[PDB]
Design an enzyme around this catalytic site. Structure first.
Site, mmCIF file in Angstrom:
data_model
loop_
_atom_site.group_PDB
_atom_site.id
_atom_site.type_symbol
_atom_site.label_atom_id
_atom_site.label_comp_id
_atom_site.label_asym_id
_atom_site.label_seq_id
_atom_site.Cartn_x
_atom_site.Cartn_y
_atom_site.Cartn_z
ATOM 1 N N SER H 13 0.865 -1.174 0.000
ATOM 2 C CA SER H 13 0.000 0.000 0.000
ATOM 3 C C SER H 13 0.902 1.224 0.000
ATOM 4 C CB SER H 13 -0.934 0.005 1.206
ATOM 5 O OG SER H 13 -1.721 1.180 1.230
ATOM 6 N N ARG H 14 0.961 1.919 -1.134
ATOM 7 C CA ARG H 14 1.904 3.018 -1.279
ATOM 8 C C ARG H 14 1.491 4.243 -0.477
ATOM 9 N NH1 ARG H 14 4.878 1.744 -5.678
ATOM 10 N NH2 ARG H 14 2.947 1.070 -6.702
ATOM 11 N N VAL H 15 0.195 4.403 -0.201
ATOM 12 C CA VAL H 15 -0.241 5.500 0.657
ATOM 13 C C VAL H 15 0.223 5.267 2.089
ATOM 14 C CG1 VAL H 15 -2.216 6.813 1.458
ATOM 15 C CG2 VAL H 15 -2.181 5.926 -0.862
#
Ligand code: ATP
Ligand code: MG
Lengths: 416, 235, 49, 130, 55, 235, 55, 104
Positions: H13-15
């Site tokens: 999850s890049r966020v």
């Protein structure tokens, strides 16, 4: 073609790109020509001294032999080629470097390395960089080998001596094949395996079969090819690698596993071959390196026991230690080629029971120190080894006793 | 070669690399625009192999025996080029680099070399007993080699020490100097016949060679050269 | 067909396993020989006792 | 003319003919001659002397047993060290060799076998599908 | 002790002789190399000035 | 950027992704009806990559110095996108997910992160020595961590305790809080000069950090910050 | 007698060591002179070749 | 048995923490670190049983945390329930209850 192209960086069309003035010449040689043929050639006998102990002792390269250098990513293929070029300082051989599809910065660094070692006095640097069109990259190795064939057929005055031996390095035949594939696909020619055109084995073969060793009837000159192939994850069975492997006489495999393990030349002795063999070696190296080859084969048969050698019997531990010392001996620093006499002396010291006392991590240092000893305390031993390197029974009692005395004198006065 | 075949002679054609013939055919087909087949190979691989190796037959008038050399890509014997070559093969002779490293110039692996004619009713009843027992003894040695290298021959019982001794004797006895080619380890020409090979290997297989050390069998002759050298050295 | 790369990685892993087990077998044979020598050296004392 | 079989639980120490021996027995030192009567002996920590043909070699024992037969004498001793040697008490070379005998060699064996097992396990579960 | 001392002293004398031999040979080699370098540099400079004069 | 290069200024260029450039080239070539190359990629892949990369060079007037992110799917470095860029690189920083999940957010693997400029003749002898010794101790720890996974560190170690401690301290010390990472963490960013980082790693390499535990090396600047944190805790 | 022979052997061995040291040093001086002469001759020949090639 | 079938090792999850409540950020960092340690030294968990105290403890904590992540279908958990459960797990309050009861 001719003497005017010596120390000049040129386009595949022959136009200079070094900014050192126009190329002086009186003869132009065609890009494409037939190979010398059947009766023109001669058996390869004169050795090409690369300066690497492992290559010059286990994978001999002779004048007129096509020896592929095949590797992967950063394993020192260009390093091996440059080391081979630097070792021809006074060997009467003209070097050519083609550099298909490389960076301008990389070719500039290669030229700077050559000219900071004095190698540009006898080197021609063709250059078809990555930004240049695929046609220039496609015709670059043929321009290089046209210059090499000019050296072979006619020769040039190098150091006041007529030289008819040329060593050419196609620093990326994988990139040359990629450029020709782009040319063919942009011409809508029918693709084959891996989208390469049908005449891609033909492509390289015309290039590589022009490297010959002519007989005395046709001049006696030679052209030595050192093609370079970059594999992908050691995929030796790819299209261009198999093509060049089948074409070339011998192969020099460079492994990333050995490169990251500290082996400075990442040479895989087990799979690499030179089918010319002992004919491409001096008699001294032929007499000395046979036991090295046997001991290294024995060690490679027992390489899985290396970390367990303290728990094995006497003979297996002795074989493992000898193999480890020999492998540490083959490690060489970059841009430091060794002459044939130094290699013969070091391999004679290692082959006989003389490196058993010195521990493994110091073997390389020992070698360096020993060479310095032979370079300072005993120049006569080096001259004696170089003088009778062509003797059929090379270890004559004179040179044998001189070398043994030098080794004993070095070992007694040094501690490791 | 078919001219000399038409004269009733027995020609032995040699082919340097039939795989390069396959690759030339594949490149020609790719250059003609034909659709590729199998592993990028030519569609006409079977017919192109047939038009060549069906002319290598034993005619009632004369005969053409042939000996090809095959390059196996990526050591894949199921590759289409070796697959199509193998369909026409009558015999195989496998050379191993391991045997070559042991200074055995005819580095033929007897456990990997096959022939369809190796039948009792064609090459002789004693042929398909001597060859079968030699292969069995060599297979026993291949099974016991790891144990011998790890433990030693002292752990081997009877009928296994003798088998290993005979296997080493025949394995070193398969070597020939090839004195016709150059003069490396030159000696008087022998050209050992088939019957002489059968008799020599039946002799050694039935004992009669156990007193010979496992170093005399090297570039030897017909097991009479072996005993001659044994008598010459020390007897 | 998972992938050529994945099967090649599995081949490398099993080859490493084979090398490790071969080394283990060799050192186990050596240790067995040493233990047998120790047993034979201890045996006269036990026999006298 | 009696062969002295000085044997320890780990190894045989001496099996040569000896013409004169002493013994630190728990009820007084006893000197055994090649004609001595059968005897059983318990040895406290003392100092046995081997005097074969006037040898007079001190030999420190830390207890054990002795069986004397009319033609042979056996010593079943617990732990023995040679008294004289070259250096005082135990020789420096003996301790130097035994220092790498069960400490360096055992540590190297344990490390090598452990690391081999760990590499095998690490490259084992990455194979996934056989 | 006298036998051991004789052997050790003989070996030490031979080693010191070879060390002095190596030292003097290395000194002569360095002197010859620097003289050769001076000669080569002079020849190169004179070749350059002769090239200019003929130019 | 070439305008700022031509003004004599040393300009910096960040290409946020390379494999997307390769994908765009492949899509453009497929849409134009060009013949596909390799695994369905563009025939002009090498030429397009060269046209992009060869403009990033150091000239006499100025110099474009670039950092280009490349995303390798899984661990495949043989895909056309990273394979076509390898020829144009002077240094590679190999980020690893395993290091990132260990809270070492600048997840650079010190191993498999090479550079052509890492030479004693360019970056100095001290820099080369420190980097080489740090890589050596990390390589030793790569096996010693496996070794201590089953055999506890206190059980047996011949200088292995010290080198394991030093390697853990330096692999934690490679972690650095970023100015742009304040959103993720809240720790203020740190900037270390190239001289200060090599000096700090030289100081930590041979003693001087064996008493500070492996908690004050987590997110710090130079070694002086690690010290200041240690004597701030011990107040 | 052993002590007398040991002293005599020590004296003979040290005298032989001195003689061999002198011989080794003399041979080293000869080799150094020969090597310096050959290096100077090679440098002169190279200088002459440079003169001819410059012309 | 991992019913949600989340492969946390390769899932990304890049966020990141910006897509989480502060309670979940507080109670999830230790969970992620412990799961990463378990995924690292889970090779010595099938047949290697001796190990040491530390490796066995890390393996067993990872097993408890993985068993905590199993969820039945159509039974979502509110964020307060999730952060309470993760606070219980990450603060050694589950160190006594055995693995094949954790979900229960
Ligand atoms: N023998 C050696 N000893 C030490 N370092 C070496 C040696 N050979 C090469 N290197 C180092 O490895 C680097 C990579 O080698 P090199 O550039 O010759 O490889 P390559 O196969 O031609 O790679 P490329 O794909 O980048 O062209 C060199 O720049 C040098 O720093
Ligand atoms: Mg290169």
């Amino acid at each position: 073609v001719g003497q005017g192209l010596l120390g000049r960086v040129v386009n595949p069309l022959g136009q200079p790109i070094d900014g050192k003035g126009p190329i002086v010449y009186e003869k132009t040689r065609p890009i494409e020509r037939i190979a010398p043929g059947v009766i023109t050639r001669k058996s390869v006998d004169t050795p090409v001294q690369t300066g690497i102990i492992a290559i010059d002792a286990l994978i001999p390269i002779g004048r007129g032999q096509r020896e592929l250098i095949i590797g992967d990513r950063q394993t020192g293929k260009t390093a091996v080629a440059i080391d081979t070029i630097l070792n021809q300082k006074g060997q009467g051989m003209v070097c050519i470097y083609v550099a298909i599809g490389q960076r301008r910065a990389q070719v500039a660094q290669v030229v700077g390395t050559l000219e900071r070692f004095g190698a540009m006095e006898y080197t021609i640097v063709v250059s078809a960089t990555a930004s240049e069109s695929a046609a220039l990259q496609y015709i670059a190795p043929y321009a290089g080998c046209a210059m090499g064939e000019e050296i072979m057929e006619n020769g040039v005055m190098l150091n006041g001596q007529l030289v008819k031996d040329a060593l050419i390095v196609y620093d990326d035949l994988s990139k040359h094949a990629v450029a020709y594939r782009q040319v063919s696909l942009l011409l809508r020619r029918p693709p084959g395996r891996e989208a390469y055109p049908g005449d891609v084995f033909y492509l390289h073969s015309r290039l590589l079969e022009r490297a010959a060793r002519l007989n005395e009837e046709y001049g006696g000159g030679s052209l030595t090819a050192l093609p370079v192939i970059e594999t992908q994850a050691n995929d030796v069975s790819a299209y261009i690698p198999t093509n060049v492997i089948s074409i070339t006489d011998g192969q020099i495999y460079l492994e990333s596993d050995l490169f990251n393990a500290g082996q400075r030349p990442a040479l895989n002795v087990g799979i690499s071959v030179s089918r010319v063999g002992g004919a491409a070696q001096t008699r001294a190296m032929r007499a000395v390196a046979g036991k090295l080859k046997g001991e290294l084969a024995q060690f490679r048969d027992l390489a899985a026991f290396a970390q367990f050698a303290s728990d094995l019997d006497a003979t297996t531990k002795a074989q493992i230690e000898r193999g480890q010392r020999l492998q540490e001996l083959l490690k060489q620093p970059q841009y430091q080629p060794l002459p044939v006499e130094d290699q013969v002396a070091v391999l004679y010291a290692a082959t006989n029971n003389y490196l058993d006392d010195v521990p493994v991590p110091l073997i390389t240092k020992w070698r360096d120190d020993f060479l310095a000893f032979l370079r300072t305390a005993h120049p006569e031993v080096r001259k004696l080894i170089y003088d009778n390197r062509l003797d059929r029974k090379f270890p004559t009692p004179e040179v044998k006793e001189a070398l043994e005395a030098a080794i004993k004198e070095f070992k007694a006065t040094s501690n490791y | 070669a078919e001219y000399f075949r038409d004269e009733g002679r027995d020609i032995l054609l040699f082919i340097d690399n039939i795989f390069r013939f396959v690759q030339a055919g594949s490149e020609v087909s790719s250059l003609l625009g034909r659709m590729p087949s199998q592993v990028g190979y030519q569609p006409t691989l079977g017919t192109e192999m047939g038009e060549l190796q069906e002319r290598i037959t034993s005619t009632k008038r004369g005969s053409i025996t042939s000996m090809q050399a095959v390059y196996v890509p990526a050591d894949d014997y199921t590759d289409p080029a070796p697959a199509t070559v193998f369909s026409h093969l009558d015999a195989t002779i496998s050379l191993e680099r391991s045997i070559a490293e042991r200074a055995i110039f005819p580095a033929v692996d007897p456990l990997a070399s096959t022939s369809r004619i190796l039948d009792p009713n064609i090459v002789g009843e004693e042929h398909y007993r001597v060859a079968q027992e030699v292969k069995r003894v060599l297979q026993r040695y291949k099974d016991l080699k790891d144990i011998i290298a790890i433990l030693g021959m002292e752990e081997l019982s009877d009928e296994d020490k003798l088998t290993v001794q005979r296997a080493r004797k025949i394995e070193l006895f398969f070597s020939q100097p090839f004195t016709v080619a150059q003069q490396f380890t030159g000696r008087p020409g022998k050209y050992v016949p088939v019957k002489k090979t059968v008799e020599s290997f039946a002799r050694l297989l039935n004992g009669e060679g156990d007193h010979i050390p496992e170093s005399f069998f090297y570039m030897q002759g017909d097991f009479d050269d072996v005993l001659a050298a044994y008598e010459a050295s020390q007897k | 067909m998972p992938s050529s790369r994945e099967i090649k990685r599995r081949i490398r892993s099993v080859k490493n396993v084979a090398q490790i087990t071969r080394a283990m077998e060799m050192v186990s044979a050596s240790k067995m020989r040493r233990a047998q020598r120790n047993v034979l050296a201890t045996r006269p004392y036990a026999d006298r006792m | 003319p009696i062969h002295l079989e000085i044997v320890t639980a780990e190894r045989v120490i001496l099996s040569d003919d000896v013409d004169m021996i002493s013994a630190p027995t728990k009820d007084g030192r006893v000197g055994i001659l090649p004609r001595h009567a059968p005897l059983m002996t318990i040895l406290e920590p003392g100092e046995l002397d081997i005097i074969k043909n006037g040898e007079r070699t001190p030999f420190a024992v830390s207890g054990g047993f002795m069986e004397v037969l009319p033609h042979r004498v056996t010593i079943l001793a617990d732990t023995v060290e040679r008294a004289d040697e070259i250096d005082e008490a135990r020789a420096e070379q003996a301790r130097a060799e035994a220092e790498a005998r069960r400490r360096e060699a055992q540590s190297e064996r344990d490390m090598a076998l452990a690391e081999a097992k760990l590499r095998k396990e690490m490259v084992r579960l990455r194979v996934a599908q056989l | 002790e006298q036998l051991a001392n004789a052997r050790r002293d003989y070996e030490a004398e031979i080693a010191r002789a070879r060390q002095e031999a190596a030292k003097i040979v290395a000194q002569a080699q360095e002197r010859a190399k620097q003289q050769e370098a001076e000669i080569i540099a002079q020849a190169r400079r004179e070749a350059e000035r002769l090239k200019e004069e003929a130019r």
